[PDB]
Amino acid sequence: DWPVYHRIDGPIVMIGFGSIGRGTLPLIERHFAFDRSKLVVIDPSDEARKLAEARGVRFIQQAVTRDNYRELLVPLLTAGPGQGFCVNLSVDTSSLDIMELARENGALYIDTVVEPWLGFYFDPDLKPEARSNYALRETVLAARRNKPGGTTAVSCCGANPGMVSWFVKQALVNLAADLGVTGEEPTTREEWARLAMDLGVKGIHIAERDTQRASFPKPFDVFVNTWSVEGFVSEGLQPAELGWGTFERWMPDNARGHDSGCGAGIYLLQPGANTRVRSWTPTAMAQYGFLVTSNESISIADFLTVRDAAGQAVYRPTCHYAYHPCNDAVLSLHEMFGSGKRQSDWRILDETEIVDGIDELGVLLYGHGKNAYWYGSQLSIEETRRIAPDQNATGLQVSSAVLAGMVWALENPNAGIVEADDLDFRRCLEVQTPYLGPVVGVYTDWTPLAGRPGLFPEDIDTSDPWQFRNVLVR
Amino acid sequence: DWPVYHRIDGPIVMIGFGSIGRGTLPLIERHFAFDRSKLVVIDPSDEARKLAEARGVRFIQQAVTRDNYRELLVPLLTAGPGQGFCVNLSVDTSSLDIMELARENGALYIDTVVEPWLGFYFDPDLKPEARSNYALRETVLAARRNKPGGTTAVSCCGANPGMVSWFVKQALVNLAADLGVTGEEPTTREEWARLAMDLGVKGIHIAERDTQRASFPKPFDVFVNTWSVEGFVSEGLQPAELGWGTFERWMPDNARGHDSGCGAGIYLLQPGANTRVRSWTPTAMAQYGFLVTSNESISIADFLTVRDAAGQAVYRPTCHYAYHPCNDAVLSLHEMFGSGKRQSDWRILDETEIVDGIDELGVLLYGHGKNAYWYGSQLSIEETRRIAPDQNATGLQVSSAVLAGMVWALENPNAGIVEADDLDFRRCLEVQTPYLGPVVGVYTDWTPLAGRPGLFPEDIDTSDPWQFRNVLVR
Numbered sequence: 001d002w003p004v005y006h007r008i009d010g011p012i013v014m015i016g017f018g019s020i021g022r023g024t025l026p027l028i029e030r031h032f033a034f035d036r037s038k039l040v041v042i043d044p045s046d047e048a049r050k051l052a053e054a055r056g057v058r059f060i061q062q063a064v065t066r067d068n069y070r071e072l073l074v075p076l077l078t079a080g081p082g083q084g085f086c087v088n089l090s091v092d093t094s095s096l097d098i099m100e101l102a103r104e105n106g107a108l109y110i111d112t113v114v115e116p117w118l119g120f121y122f123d124p125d126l127k128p129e130a131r132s133n134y135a136l137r138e139t140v141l142a143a144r145r146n147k148p149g150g151t152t153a154v155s156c157c158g159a160n161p162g163m164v165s166w167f168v169k170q171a172l173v174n175l176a177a178d179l180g181v182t183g184e185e186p187t188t189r190e191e192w193a194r195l196a197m198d199l200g201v202k203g204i205h206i207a208e209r210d211t212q213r214a215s216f217p218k219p220f221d222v223f224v225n226t227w228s229v230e231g232f233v234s235e236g237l238q239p240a241e242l243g244w245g246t247f248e249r250w251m252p253d254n255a256r257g258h259d260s261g262c263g264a265g266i267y268l269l270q271p272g273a274n275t276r277v278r279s280w281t282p283t284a285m286a287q288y289g290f291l292v293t294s295n296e297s298i299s300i301a302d303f304l305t306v307r308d309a310a311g312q313a314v315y316r317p318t319c320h321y322a323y324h325p326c327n328d329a330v331l332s333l334h335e336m337f338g339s340g341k342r343q344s345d346w347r348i349l350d351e352t353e354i355v356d357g358i359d360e361l362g363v364l365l366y367g368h369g370k371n372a373y374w375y376g377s378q379l380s381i382e383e384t385r386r387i388a389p390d391q392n393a394t395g396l397q398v399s400s401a402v403l404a405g406m407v408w409a410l411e412n413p414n415a416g417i418v419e420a421d422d423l424d425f426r427r428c429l430e431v432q433t434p435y436l437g438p439v440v441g442v443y444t445d446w447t448p449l450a451g452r453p454g455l456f457p458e459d460i461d462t463s464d465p466w467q468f469r470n471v472l473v474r
Numbered sequence: 475d476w477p478v479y480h481r482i483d484g485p486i487v488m489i490g491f492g493s494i495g496r497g498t499l500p501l502i503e504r505h506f507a508f509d510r511s512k513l514v515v516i517d518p519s520d521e522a523r524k525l526a527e528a529r530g531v532r533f534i535q536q537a538v539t540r541d542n543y544r545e546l547l548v549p550l551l552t553a554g555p556g557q558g559f560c561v562n563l564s565v566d567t568s569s570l571d572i573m574e575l576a577r578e579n580g581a582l583y584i585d586t587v588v589e590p591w592l593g594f595y596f597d598p599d600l601k602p603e604a605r606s607n608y609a610l611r612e613t614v615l616a617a618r619r620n621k622p623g624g625t626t627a628v629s630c631c632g633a634n635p636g637m638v639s640w641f642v643k644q645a646l647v648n649l650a651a652d653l654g655v656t657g658e659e660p661t662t663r664e665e666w667a668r669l670a671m672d673l674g675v676k677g678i679h680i681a682e683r684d685t686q687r688a689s690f691p692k693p694f695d696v697f698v699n700t701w702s703v704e705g706f707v708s709e710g711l712q713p714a715e716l717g718w719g720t721f722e723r724w725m726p727d728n729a730r731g732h733d734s735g736c737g738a739g740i741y742l743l744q745p746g747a748n749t750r751v752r753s754w755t756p757t758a759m760a761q762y763g764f765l766v767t768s769n770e771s772i773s774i775a776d777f778l779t780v781r782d783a784a785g786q787a788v789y790r791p792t793c794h795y796a797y798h799p800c801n802d803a804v805l806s807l808h809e810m811f812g813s814g815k816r817q818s819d820w821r822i823l824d825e826t827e828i829v830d831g832i833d834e835l836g837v838l839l840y841g842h843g844k845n846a847y848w849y850g851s852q853l854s855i856e857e858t859r860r861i862a863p864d865q866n867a868t869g870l871q872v873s874s875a876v877l878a879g880m881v882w883a884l885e886n887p888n889a890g891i892v893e894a895d896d897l898d899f900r901r902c903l904e905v906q907t908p909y910l911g912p913v914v915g916v917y918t919d920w921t922p923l924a925g926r927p928g929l930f931p932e933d934i935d936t937s938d939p940w941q942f943r944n945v946l947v948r
């Protein structure tokens with residue numbers, strides 16, 4: 001039967017019961033021991049309430065806000081007898097404030113995004129830089145500097161960000177092995193960074209192709225996606241953003257850096273979901289991805305930074321998302337950007353609506369001696385239905401990563417604020433792999449210069465195919 | 475009972491029997507009197523042969539080429555007893571050479587594109603300028619200067635180019651009435667051009683939204699369209715191209731003009747089917763179109779040019795395509811450009827495969843006192859099936875325009891080389907209108923600056939919303 005990893009000896013408070021909460025709840029029930037009445041779900045949606053009622057779980061129909069979160073969450077998280085777990089799978093809530101509250105009260109915490117309080121983005125007073133995931137991540141880094149150690153809080157532990165950090169580590173190990181480089185895997189951050197440098201990894205795409213499709217065609221004036229529409233649109237309207245590698249010799253005129261912080265990022269003064277990059281996955285082969293911001297674009301580049309004695313970066317990989325969402329989401333983006341406004345309605349595809357497809361999600365490491373290597377999951381909707389209820393393949397990659405991070409947090413409960421890059425990647429993948437379908441590593445000789453130049457003049461760098469100059473669609 | 479407009483007493487030579495030839499043959503049979511034995515279809519494909527044989531029509535299974543066209547076509551065109559009609563609905567053949575051959579032999583001619591001989595669209599030694607539709611059209615204008623008058627040959631008489639020239643005239647008439655501009659309806663080119671000028675028409679989009687969709691979803695690695703895939707891809711890879719208005723104050727850095735010719739055009743050093751423009755149709759409302767080259771982008775701008783005594787243009791409208799094809803074609807373009815190569819297979823949607831949808835095709839005249847006015851057809855697939863066989867809504871708009879052009883040519887058989895702008899628009903619409911479904915005019919207050927500026931800095935011209943600077947997606 002399914003492994004029960006740990007007893008949770010306190011309340012389990014799940015904030016949000018949308019596509020990911022719905023997929024995560026059954027895994028929590030499956031893999032942890034606890035009295036059923038310890039778990040409570042908080043979400044303002046009537047749709048969510050009705051579903052929770054049908055699952056027989058406690059439900060509080062309330063939006064968590066800047067004004068109520070202390071009065072609501074402190075009693076719930078401290079109900080006893082021991083340590084509770086705050087599982088934050090919401091939109092419109094501050095990850096940082098809720099994380100800090102959980103830690104203050106001795107509750108474990110996990111989320112899948114650094115989300116701000118409602119109102120953050122649609123404010124005309126914010127400069128583009130302040131709307132970046134780099135800036136949001138810096139709030140978490142500052143929180144950790146201010147309060148080192150303490151109760152474990154896992155930031156950004158979904159599929160991507162989250163699982164893909166573990167895939168990067170596995171991929172680096174595999175690349176070394178494939179070269180005949182034997183000897184123990186890295187143990188420390190510096191050793192991981194040096195492995196990437198030593199292997200000559202220039203950069204990393206989070207290279208994803210979602211091929212799920214529904215039994216109904218995309219409706220006019222409806223945004224369709226396989227996970228949060230609100231979340232995807234919000235991030236798609238944030239600046240295009242990337243971890244910025246030391247090898248890069250060019251950036252766009254509308255690229256900007258940061259005065260402060262870890263030093264690993266740039267952003268572009270244009271929306272990520274209307275920015276295309278040339279990328280590749282095993283099933284897609286060459287494809288366009290959208291350069292949507294993501295926490296791990298920064299966090300992986302930061303993690304794999306090698307510095308000199310003076311503290312200047314001497315090696316860092318480029319890292320960013322290259323997302324090809326499901327076809328109906330591609331059409332939804334074309335519709336939304338073309339109309340200059342959000343659609344009147346939206347829907348997230350349910351497993352009962354999906355006729356076939358996979359969520360092919362992995363990491364594409366490039367620039368090393370074997371050109372490019374993609375490592376990741378090819379989870380199909382058919383396999384998903386066999387192994388976990390109430391979610392599609394996109395959802396299961398996320399919910400199983402949350403499961404893995406929860407196991408890690410329960411196993412390592414005094415680790416302070418951590419990102420997926422800080423966790424034991426082998427333990428996490430051990431927990432997650434039963435939910436990932438085929439997990440494979442594939443080399444390719446494809447580069448962004450394949451077939452170029454064509455019929456028109458292009459500004460390309462033929463000396464270094466993987467330069468962002470060649471990847472960015474201009 | 476369907477009107478039988480005229481008897482055709484000579485050979486009817488149909489070159490090409492793809493989507494448009496298949497839709498056009500039954501209209502020819504319906505609306506002209508002739509012995510069926512006098513029709514001959516020429517196409518290299520087995521598929522075409524089998525369909526022709528099923529219709530009991532003479533078929534010759536040959537590709538027309540530069541090497542064979544004289545020896546192949548002259549006996550067919552001159553078989554008698556009367557004047558023949560060459561109906562050219564092919565790809566990979568020279569419209570100019572066939573048209574000249576038909577004229578030399580006293581046969582009427584019609585086509586829907588200025589096509590070059592096979593090999594042109596991918597000659598690596600061709601400069602971008604030479605790949606433009608402006609350049610191709612100039613070969614036709616030069617032919618007309620060399621041999622004025624004579625047997626009628628109608629160049630570019632499909633839906634667009636073709637029908638939309640007639641819609642522009644009707645739209646100018648309607649605008650004059652609504653804006654209270656007094657004067658007789660124009661009856662010469664110079665009078666039409668002066669009317670556009672007097673109305674303050676800054677520019678025109680050929681503004682199209684195809685919403686046809688099939689009973690099967692888009693297959694991976696298959697290009698799907700509602701008319702020629704080979705044709706659409708070829709034109710999509712030609713430079714983005716537009717008739718260039720005197721009101722325009724800016725053009726992009728990669729825009730180029732022409733040192734000779736009618737003077738009406740610019741092109742961009744990028745492919746038209748990967749170039750987006752902000753546009754509008756009644757059903758789509760605000761949408762992206764692709765800036766795919768089209769003969770009428772140049773021909774309409776040229777037709778509506780007012781020159782001073784010295785022969786310098788003092789008024790000319792901007793004119794270009796803003797094409798939103800069917801959703802499966804949108805996905806096909808994303809796939810093709812994203813992969814950097816044509817898909818391995820393609821298909822044209824048959825009426826038997828299409829579940830619903832329309833081809834909304836009209837002209838959007840902008841910059842006048844009522845902002846913008848769209849005039850055109852909203853033909854549905856359901857109506858198409860009721861009124862004409864063997865074609866979808868896209869096809870019927872084209873085949874019915876060819877029919878109208880044929881009627882006009884028989885009624886005006888010694889008019890020389892003409893474009894759709896040169897034909898009697900009321901007569902042509904009288905023939906075509908039974909096949910166009912709802913034909914409507916709609917005003918809108920939408921402009922390309924709607925909702926702009928937004929989240930990010932943009933290079934806009936706030937003084938004049940309709941500037942290309944604002945329309946082009948950059």
Ligand SMILES: NC(=O)c1ccc[n+]([C@@H]2O[C@H](COP(=O)([O-])OP(=O)(O)OC[C@H]3O[C@@H](n4cnc5c(N)ncnc54)[C@H](O)[C@@H]3O)[C@@H](O)[C@H]2O)c1
Pocket residue numbers: 015016017018019020021042043044045048062063064065089090091092093112113115156157158159160161162227228229230231232348398
């Ligand atoms: N790291 C990853 O791989 C990854 C993947 C998917 C989603 N996410 C993120 O996970 C989160 C959930 O995604 P989803 O697909 O379940 O989204 P969803 O849109 O399906 O659900 C969001 C849910 O949060 C709710 N909610 C809104 N305001 C709230 C508030 N004030 N308090 C409590 N709940 C509130 C909605 O009512 C709702 O049911 C999103 O923030 C998201 O961007 C991360």
Ligand SMILES: NC(=O)c1ccc[n+]([C@@H]2O[C@H](COP(=O)([O-])OP(=O)(O)OC[C@H]3O[C@@H](n4cnc5c(N)ncnc54)[C@H](O)[C@@H]3O)[C@@H](O)[C@H]2O)c1
Pocket residue numbers: 489490491492493494495516517518519522536537538539563564565566567586587589630631632633634635636701702703704705706822872
């Ligand atoms: N003006 C408009 O509105 C408009 C609209 C649709 C199509 N078109 C144009 O009409 C033409 C036909 O379009 P379609 O949808 O029927 O295309 P299609 O791709 O369906 O058919 C083209 C046909 O030409 C053939 N052919 C190829 N090479 C040939 C040769 N050397 N000699 C004779 N025949 C040959 C194919 O075998 C074929 O059956 C295309 O050139 C096109 O771009 C114009």
Ligand SMILES: N=C(N)NCCCCN
Pocket residue numbers: 159160161208227235292293294295321361394
């Ligand atoms: N990383 C993001 N920007 N969003 C989360 C995407 C989840 C789909 N695998």
Ligand SMILES: N=C(N)NCCCCN
Pocket residue numbers: 189299302303415416417418419421422
């Ligand atoms: N992941 C990093 N960028 N740095 C290491 C942080 C370690 C937190 N305990």
Ligand SMILES: N=C(N)NCCCCN
Pocket residue numbers: 633634635682701709766767768769795835868
């Ligand atoms: N005008 C073109 N570039 N192509 C012909 C388009 C036919 C769809 N109405």
Ligand SMILES: N=C(N)NCCCCN
Pocket residue numbers: 663773776777889890891892893895896
């Ligand atoms: N349509 C033009 N641009 N000029 C007028 C041509 C008239 C051909 N008899």
